Design a protein around this ligand. Structure first.
Ligand SMILES: CCCCCCCCCCCCCCCCCC(=O)OC[C@H](COP(=O)([O-])OCC(O)COP(=O)([O-])OC[C@@H](COC(=O)CCCCCCCCCCCCCCCCC)OC(=O)CCCCCCCCCCCCCCCCC)OC(=O)CCCCCCCCCCCCCCCCC
Ligand SMILES: CCCCCCCCCCCCCCCCCC(=O)OC[C@H](COP(=O)([O-])OCC[N+](C)(C)C)OC(=O)CCCCCCCCCCCCCCCCC
Ligand SMILES: CCCCCCCCCCCCCCCCCC(=O)OC[C@H](COP(=O)([O-])OCC[N+](C)(C)C)OC(=O)CCCCCCCCCCCCCCCCC
Ligand SMILES: CCCCCCCCCCCCCCCCCC(=O)OC[C@H](COP(=O)([O-])OCC[N+](C)(C)C)OC(=O)CCCCCCCCCCCCCCCCC
Ligand SMILES: CCCCCCCCCCCCCCCCC[C@@H](O)O[C@H](CO[C@H](O)CCCCCCCCCCCCCCC)COP(=O)(O)OCC[N+](C)(C)C
Ligand SMILES: CCCCCCCCCCCCCCCCC[C@@H](O)O[C@H](CO[C@H](O)CCCCCCCCCCCCCCC)COP(=O)(O)OCC[N+](C)(C)C
Ligand SMILES: CCCCCCCC/C=C/CCCCCCCC(=O)OC[C@H](COP(=O)(O)OCCN)OC(=O)CCCCCCC/C=C/CCCCCCCC
Ligand SMILES: CCCCCCCC/C=C/CCCCCCCC(=O)OC[C@H](COP(=O)(O)OCCN)OC(=O)CCCCCCC/C=C/CCCCCCCC
Ligand SMILES: CC(C)NC(=N)NC(=N)Nc1ccc(Cl)cc1
Ligand SMILES: CC(C)NC(=N)NC(=N)Nc1ccc(Cl)cc1
Ligand code: SF4
Ligand code: SF4
Ligand code: SF4
Lengths: 371, 309, 176, 156, 70, 144, 56
């Protein structure tokens, strides 16, 4: 709804595409420069608003790498589980909105009921249905409420049937195959060099995935498969997304089985706020709470670039700290920026409906594109 | 009494169009796991009235750079031709019994094509004009296919009389006889009415009252197409002493076909323009010609030529 | 590990060719899609009857802000301005002076609800649990001004929702 | 008076149609648009209230500004608002639409869509719950129920 | 549930019942309780004209027979 | 069977107190389901529970026909419920206020109020602080 | 759920899978909205001795 596209056509073909991004630019990086490290978390929460907890996790990983601290194992497992839940949310949104643009809406409504249930999980764990601000540098804000894992298990039980119902309407449909097959074909070298990451690379056939090549949190303790495309088109990307949903279900099952006990934030009151009882009974805890919530913890001077495998590709944060309690520089690399830059390459020799399909398969969020 | 018959043919059609809008919304909701309008009235039986009242008491936006003559004529022509195609339909007795009723339907549809072109050319906007041109091309192609199919079907009827169609279908169903023609006829009617998966135009300049005229014309055309298909391929038994049985059966079949239209719209994605154009000229037209040849040859080779009278 | 999603050559034997030709001529997958949609039609809808039925919530839900009091009736806020320090959106404006009895109490406490992002940082930073996010979420207004709450409005909200807010805090204060 | 009674009844009839049949144009600019999709989802089903899922600007009566309105986007919003035919209403959903939200002090953000278009209903939240947006829509409906156009006209 | 769609379908069926039933009733009313004559050909039209002439009340549906000839 | 469903519908008709009650609950609530009564507040709202329904439809409220000074026979809001029944209805707990009464305080409102936007009782903001700088008042006695 | 037996057979045949096992609606299988109070554990640094911050 915030996309302006200038297209030069030759009768029916599309000879030139020019995306005029910038309709959702808000100066997020400068605002982050003016905020502190804790006050900048919701900014990442609002960058890619289908992968909110994934963006929170990326920012938390960057800040923790700068601080040279380590989250507890239970916090890491919770972060991985909710990252997989958010990946399910994002893939559902992408596939359903792609179909909604190309015709079909009933899978949109079904999978959005499923999204409503996952938002109920989000609200139970955080209190906010969309922008949890739950994953923070040093762990997570609060422990899981009792009985949440049982509901997550029930949802995981009753989701493969939903995926199968979605596939019954689109996978073998000849209309869907006509709309998606051999459209937006991109070679492996061109995809890379234009700067592609994630689903685009997997569809083009490149065996690359950050969760397996550069593991973070406890992603190296779970078993899952990486879908690989063969023709590098919209249909292959759709199949890859569906298989990624199934693999994320498997990872969720593993996390539910192997959730460990312990604390949920780093036991370092100079970084993570102390508990309320300790703050109300201990002078050191009160001082640390006061300082953390007024000035904020200082981060040693340096510069880091941390990237994670967000559901839309490689999401990266380049954080530059000058030793103060506020970040000096914060560059946000969103996967959709390079994809929308490469939209013109993929739209050659196609039509308007093909351009719509290419945008849908690129799965562009203009919030993260513009920042 | 003839004016009374005309009004009894006209007004219930408009009421059925409004409640068809309501039924379509509810059926789409229940297929999409929603509920549909159930708030405005008891089980939602006031939504068409509310929509009609709002559209009537809504401000129009007639463009300054527009031909007022065409801008007024196009909805009038569309609605008049939508209402006209109900007078030769027998249920079981047509209002106007014509010796050649089918050709009247074909001519009325061919004239009804003009409304899209005139509405597109009235707005004096390039993009709406291009959309209208694409719609015209799609409609004329599927008109060719519909004409060939309808010619093929009537070779087992013996004439262009729908009463003779009923008499022919007294025993068994033309859908049993010629089901591939039924498939192609149903798809071509979908494409002609521009319902999904062929709603390329809606996938704009008119608003408020004149928009409602086009909406009513389109839905009346949909109902008329379903009724014609039910008569042509799903012929019911007619008893001269109790005609109401045939009327009930025909109405049930028409409702089933319209509900199938809504079902297909809910179920399927949208075709691309060139894809649906290649669907006809390269997949439907050759099969239509082959089946036309087969249905010409069949009565001669089986000594089953229908009577002219 | 990895897997292939669309690398599977169909067999070219006469049986498979005839099956694929029948699928092309007879719309088998389209009939399958119709059947799935019909099944969903005959399923039960998942719609709640709002406003007579409400969607499930949690004690951690963040909604309209409120200022609490002690059981003795004295207001909990001590004018410490950790609110203003930690608010990401700078939606809280606090001005304080000694009270007539010498207490450290606020004289101005304004929250711009059109600027707040409902992030819940203010109730985490309160050492006395004065400012809270109440469970109310149906406080839509017909003017921009009505969303500029002040101390009187916040105290009225706290008095109005004190029972539910106290119950939620009692239920979810062990996780904090 | 018979004339007063007739104009009151006609006003009640006309307001009932507009209240019951709402065709909103969703200006989904940012994360607040997702909650609108969840309101249109099966659980809440905005369609059952007579609120159509989506409509074109020409056939729309309500504009739901849901998202951050930027300087590069404000002219388009004003253009579509002008193109909407009267009677027209505006619902500003979320902090970004209401005021500035998290981006109030940004150089490239319009601090409130009320600086561009007259807003009828303000829905607070970030993002507002689907129930909150539904409550705002019902409040707009009840506000339409209080319109007295014919009563004002008859007393001119 | 799914049976809430029936009232709308019921109203549609009631509306679509009116045309055919009204046409049949008017045809039987304007022809003395008999189906309207279908004059698809000049022979049938001549038969109708002869019937009207022999009736003499200027109504083709007023049929005469053996009691009329003798 | 269909007969069982028809009998259930007739029982629902009889469960609301005849025909007038059934029509009233159909037209002002758009639902004719019957459930066990849990309790009633001081304003007239009646809260019903039916655990056989799926989650989200197992608890509901029938609003009163008149709350405070406003006629609410047709115009019913979600803000008309008191906070305790609000918590119960939104399912933050499994304990109705009748079973678990809220703690009583001398400052808690005894009368609940709904959203008063668009009404003369609407909230109007104002500055709650005194003037910062006091001006100098000239003397009231002429110098010459 | 509460559907009739014929309706259940029709929906199972049309979909091709047994839908009674996998229901989109939650029927009392979810956790209670009221849970017993928890007792969260402490971290590794909650030690009264040999816990100097200069070593961690
Ligand atoms: C102004 C005020 C007006 C109203 C005043 C008040 C009236 C009160 C009446 C009280 C008594 C009757 C209540 C009827 C239902 C009302 C809602 C209700 O309470 O529901 C709960 C009530 C109790 O059920 P429950 O306790 O909720 O159980 C839940 C279960 O999940 C349920 O499980 P299930 O759903 O799986 O099982 C039931 C299902 C199980 O089904 C089966 O076993 C058979 C399956 C068949 C499959 C194919 C069906 C069609 C498929 C395509 C659909 C598209 O059976 C049916 O659905 C069959 C229904 C009965 C036959 C309908 C015959 C009419 C057809 C209408 C169209 C054609 C009309 C032609 C004539 C036109 C001219 C008049 O449900 C029923 O009573 C359902 C059965 C009756 C439905 C009747 C629907 C309306 C028919 C038209 C009536 C007139 C309408 C208005 C006309 C215009 C007036 C101006
Ligand atoms: C905007 C474009 C407008 C284009 C048209 C403008 C001019 C209209 C001229 C109307 C001429 C009418 C001719 C018929 C006169 C009566 C002849 C007769 O009795 O025929 C018996 C025949 C009987 O049918 P039959 O063929 O079965 O006859 C054999 C059977 N016997 C002999 C027993 C009767 O009637 C017909 O053929 C009916 C079809 C008439 C077709 C011509 C009229 C078309 C009207 C629709 C088009 C115009 C719509 C305009 C809408 C508004 C636009 C702003
Ligand atoms: C939205 C989901 C739709 C699911 C499918 C619904 C239609 C079921 C038929 C198969 C799928 C559609 C195929 C195309 C259309 C086929 C038409 C067809 O065969 O129709 C069958 C019957 C009519 O066929 P019939 O069997 O009655 O006719 C006999 C015909 N002869 C004598 C020539 C052999 O129509 C219907 O079932 C209508 C279905 C649509 C309307 C639904 C609401 C009414 C429900 C039944 C009410 C019964 C009492 C009515 C009043 C009686 C008074 C005495
Ligand atoms: C098949 C049916 C098709 C048609 C269906 C629709 C028609 C039937 C329902 C119509 C309902 C009425 C709608 C009218 C429009 C109302 C809203 C509107 O446009 O308001 C804007 C205006 C408001 O006027 P205004 O001048 O105050 O406008 C404000 C200023 N501007 C223009 C800047 C906005 O409405 C009118 O001007 C309408 C007034 C005339 C209508 C009749 C009102 C009086 C009726 C009673 C008369 C006396 C009776 C007793 C004595 C009798 C003696 C003989
Ligand atoms: C063939 C076409 C038929 C179309 C309609 C078919 C379906 C009709 C269904 C109608 C069911 C009855 C609806 C009743 C709604 C509630 C009526 C009432 O609430 O509204 C009153 C005013 O509403 C109207 O007077 C009632 C209209 C009922 C419907 C009339 C028939 C529908 C019009 C048909 C037009 C067909 C042409 C349009 C086709 C598109 C205001 O009363 P109120 O102020 O609260 O008094 C206090 C309430 N007390 C008494 C209980 C304390
Ligand atoms: C094709 C064009 C069609 C023309 C049709 C013309 C015929 C007029 C149309 C009549 C339609 C039916 C009348 C309106 C139905 C009212 C339904 C009633 O229930 O509404 C009530 C509203 O009543 C109001 O007081 C207005 C009554 C409606 C207007 C009635 C006017 C009197 C009848 C028409 C007289 C026309 C003028 C005659 C002058 C001599 C309460 O509903 P609501 O507001 O949602 O609040 C409940 C909200 N819930 C559901 C969530 C609980
Ligand atoms: C993305 C596609 C969008 C681009 C294409 C959209 C084209 C829209 C062009 C917008 C220009 C507006 C004029 C075109 C529509 C004219 C509609 C109209 O005539 O409405 C008249 C009617 C007048 O009032 P009444 O209802 O008759 O009396 C009661 C008063 N309350 O409505 C109005 O209030 C409109 C009056 C002022 C609007 C016109 C002001 C702008 C005119 C400048 C010229 C622009 C022309 C556009 C040229 C298009 C090609 C470049
Ligand atoms: C009225 C009853 C309703 C009951 C049915 C319920 C509704 C079912 C409708 C669902 C259909 C969904 C909408 C369909 C839209 C798209 C249709 C479609 O795609 O068909 C095109 C299809 C394939 O196109 P593509 O694969 O894309 O082209 C690539 C070529 N290699 O082509 C077609 O023409 C379809 C075939 C139609 C005719 C079938 C005839 C079968 C052969 C007949 C043999 C018998 C000959 C008779 C002689 C007998 C001698 C003894
Ligand atoms: C920025 C991302 C998260 N949001 C979406 N608006 N994707 C999109 N294609 N969704 C959508 C929803 C409704 C309609 Cl009518 C058309 C498209
Ligand atoms: C496809 C969408 C825009 N349409 C609708 N949900 N209802 C509709 N256009 N309104 C309407 C209802 C009745 C009549 Cl007679 C004329 C118009
Ligand atoms: S919830 Fe967050 S943005 Fe809102 S007032 Fe509290 S600290 Fe500020
Ligand atoms: S944190 Fe608490 S005590 Fe401090 S200013 Fe805010 S409400 Fe008052
Ligand atoms: S108010 Fe919050 S959720 Fe809505 S657009 Fe702004 S940042 Fe996104």
């Amino acid at each position: 709804g915030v996309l302006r596209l200038v297209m030069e056509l030759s009768g029916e073909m599309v000879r030139k595409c020019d995306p005029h991004i910038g309709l959702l630019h808000r100066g997020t990086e400068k605002l982050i420069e003016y905020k502190t490290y804790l006050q900048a978390l919701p900014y990442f929460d609002r960058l890619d608003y289908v992968s909110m907890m994934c963006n929170e996790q990326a920012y938390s990983l960057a800040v923790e790498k700068l601080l040279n601290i380590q989250p507890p194992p239970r916090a890491q497992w919770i972060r991985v589980l909710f990252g997989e839940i958010t990946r399910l949310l994002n893939h559902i949104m992408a596939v359903t909105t792609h179909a909604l643009d190309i015709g079909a809406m009933t899978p949109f409504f079904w999978m959005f009921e499923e999204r409503e249930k996952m938002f109920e999980f989000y609200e139970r764990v955080s209190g906010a249905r969309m922008h949890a601000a739950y994953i923070r540098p040093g762990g997570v804000h609060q422990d899981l409420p009792l009985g949440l894992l049982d509901d997550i298990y029930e949802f995981s039980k009753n989701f493969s049937f939903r995926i199968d119902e979605l596939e019954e309407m689109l996978t073998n449909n000849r209309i869907w195959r006509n709309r998606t097959v051999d459209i937006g074909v991109v070679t492996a070298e061109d995809a890379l060099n234009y700067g592609f990451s994630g689903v685009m690379l997997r569809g083009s056939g490149i065996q690359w995935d950050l969760r397996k090549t550069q593991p973070y949190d406890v992603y190296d303790q779970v078993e899952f498969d990486v879908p690989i495309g063969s023709r590098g088109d919209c249909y292959d990307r759709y199949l890859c997304r569906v298989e990624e949903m199934r693999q994320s279900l498997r990872i969720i099952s593993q996390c539910l089985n192997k959730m460990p006990p312990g604390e949920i934030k780093v036991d370092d009151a100079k970084v993570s706020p102390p508990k309320r009882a300790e703050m109300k009974t201990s002078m050191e805890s009160l001082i640390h709470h006061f300082k953390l919530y007024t000035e904020g913890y200082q981060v040693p001077p340096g510069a880091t670039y941390t990237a994670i495998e967000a559901p839309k590709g490689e999401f990266g944060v380049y954080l530059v700290s000058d030793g103060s309690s506020r970040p000096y520089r914060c560059k946000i690399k969103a996967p959709g920026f390079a994809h929308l830059a490469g939209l013109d390459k993929m739209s050659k020799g196609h039509m308007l409906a093909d351009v719509v399909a290419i945008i849908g398969t690129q799965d562009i969020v203009f919030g993260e594109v513009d920042r | 009494m003839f004016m009374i018959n005309i009004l009894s043919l006209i007004i219930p059609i408009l009421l059925a169009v409004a409640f068809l809008t309501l039924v379509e919304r509810k059926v789409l909701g229940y297929m999409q796991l929603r509920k549909g309008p159930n708030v405005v009235g008891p089980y939602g039986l006031l939504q068409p009235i509310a929509d009609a009242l709002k559209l009537f008491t809504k401000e129009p936006l007639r463009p300054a750079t527009s031909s007022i003559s065409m801008f007024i004529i196009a909805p009038i022509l569309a609605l008049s031709l939508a209402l006209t195609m109900w007078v030769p339909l027998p249920m079981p007795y047509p209002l106007i019994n014509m010796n050649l009723g089918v050709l009247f339907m074909l001519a009325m549809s061919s004239l009804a094509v003009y409304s899209i072109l005139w509405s597109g050319w009235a707005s004096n906007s390039k993009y709406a004009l291009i959309g209208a041109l694409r719609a015209v091309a799609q409609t004329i192609s599927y008109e060719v296919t519909l004409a060939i199919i309808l010619l093929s079907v009537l070779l087992m009827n013996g004439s262009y009389t729908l009463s003779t169609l009923i008499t022919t279908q007294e025993h068994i169903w033309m859908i049993f006889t010629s089901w591939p023609l039924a498939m192609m006829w149903f798809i071509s009617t979908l494409a002609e009415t521009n319902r999904a998966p062929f709603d390329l135009t809606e996938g704009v300049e008119y608003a408020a009252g004149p928009f409602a005229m086009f909406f009513m014309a389109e839905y009346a055309n949909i109902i008329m197409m379903n009724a014609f298909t039910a008569i042509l391929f799903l012929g019911a038994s007619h008893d001269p002493h109790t005609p109401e049985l045939y009327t009930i059966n025909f109405v049930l079949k028409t409702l089933a076909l319209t509900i199938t239209f809504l079902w297909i719209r809910a179920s399927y994605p949208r075709f691309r323009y060139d894809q649906l154009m290649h669907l006809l000229w390269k997949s439907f037209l050759p099969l239509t010609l082959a089946l036309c040849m087969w249905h010409i040859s069949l009565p001669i080779m089986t000594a089953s030529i229908p009577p002219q009278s | 590990t990895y897997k292939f999603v669309n690398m599977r050559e169909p067999s070219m034997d006469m049986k498979s060719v005839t099956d694929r030709a029948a699928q092309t001529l007879l719309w088998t997958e389209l009939v399958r899609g119709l059947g799935m949609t019909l099944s969903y039609l005959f399923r039960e809808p998942a719609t709640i009857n709002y406003p007579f039925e409400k969607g499930p919530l949690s004690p951690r839900f963040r909604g309209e802000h409120a200022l609490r009091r002690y059981p003795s009736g004295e207001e909990r806020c001590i004018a410490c301005k950790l609110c203003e320090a930690v608010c990401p959106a700078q939606a809280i404006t606090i001005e304080a002076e000694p009270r007539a009895d010498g207490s450290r109490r606020t004289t101005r406490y304004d929250i711009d609800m059109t600027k707040c992002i409902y992030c819940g940082f203010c109730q985490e930073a309160c050492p006395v649990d004065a400012i809270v996010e109440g469970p109310n979420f149906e406080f839509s207004t017909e003017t921009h001004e009505e969303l500029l709450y002040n101390k009187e409005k916040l105290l009225n909200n706290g008095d109005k929702w004190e029972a539910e807010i106290a119950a939620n805090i009692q239920a979810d204060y062990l996780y904090r | 008076s018979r004339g007063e009674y007739v104009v009151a009844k006609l006003d009640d009839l006309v307001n009932w149609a507009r209240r019951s049949s709402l065709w909103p144009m969703t200006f989904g600019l940012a994360c607040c648009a997702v909650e609108m999709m969840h309101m249109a989802a099966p659980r809440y089903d905005m369609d059952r209230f007579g609120v159509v899922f989506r409509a074109s600007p020409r056939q729309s009566d309500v504009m739901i500004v849901a998202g951050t309105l930027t300087n590069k986007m404000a002219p388009a919003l004003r253009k579509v608002y002008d193109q909407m035919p009267e009677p027209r209403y505006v619902v500003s959903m979320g902090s970004c639409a209401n005021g500035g939200g998290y981006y109030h002090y940004s150089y490239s953000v319009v601090r409130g869509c009320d600086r561009i278009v007259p807003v009828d209903i303000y829905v607070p939240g970030c993002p507002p719950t689907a129930e909150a947006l539904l409550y705002g829509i019902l409040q707009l409906q009840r506000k339409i129920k209080r319109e007295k156009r014919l009563r004002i006209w008859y007393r001119r | 549930m799914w049976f809430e769609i029936l009232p709308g379908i019921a109203v549609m069926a009631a509306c679509l019942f009116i045309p055919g039933m009204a046409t049949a009733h008017i045809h039987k009313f304007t022809n003395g309780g008999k189906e309207k004559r279908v004059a698809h050909f000049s022979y049938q039209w001549n038969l109708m004209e002869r019937d009207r002439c022999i009736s003499g009340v200027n109504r083709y549906h007023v049929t005469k027979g053996l009691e009329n000839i003798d | 069977e269909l007969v069982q469903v028809l009998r259930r519908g007739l029982q629902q008709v009889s469960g609301h107190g005849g025909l007038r009650g059934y029509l009233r609950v159909l037209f002002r609530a758009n639902d004719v389901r019957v459930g066990t009564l849990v309790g009633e507040d001081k304003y007239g709202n009646k809260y019903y529970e039916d655990n056989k329904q799926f989650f989200g439809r197992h608890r509901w409220v029938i609003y009163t026909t008149e709350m405070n000074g406003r006629d609410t026979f047709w115009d019913v809001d979600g803000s008309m419920v008191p906070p305790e029944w609000h918590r119960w209805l939104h399912c933050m707990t499994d304990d109705p206020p009748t079973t678990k009464p809220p703690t009583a305080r001398k400052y808690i409102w005894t009368n609940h109020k709904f959203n008063v936007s668009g009404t003369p009782q609407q909230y109007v903001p104002y500055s709650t602080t005194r003037k910062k700088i006091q001006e100098w008042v000239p003397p009231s006695t002429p110098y010459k | 759920a509460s559907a009739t037996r014929v309706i259940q057979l029709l929906r199972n045949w049309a979909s091709g899978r047994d839908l009674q096992a996998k229901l989109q609606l939650r029927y009392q299988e979810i956790s209670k909205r009221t849970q017993p109070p928890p007792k969260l554990p402490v971290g590794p640094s909650h030690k009264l001795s040999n816990n100097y911050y200069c070593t961690r």
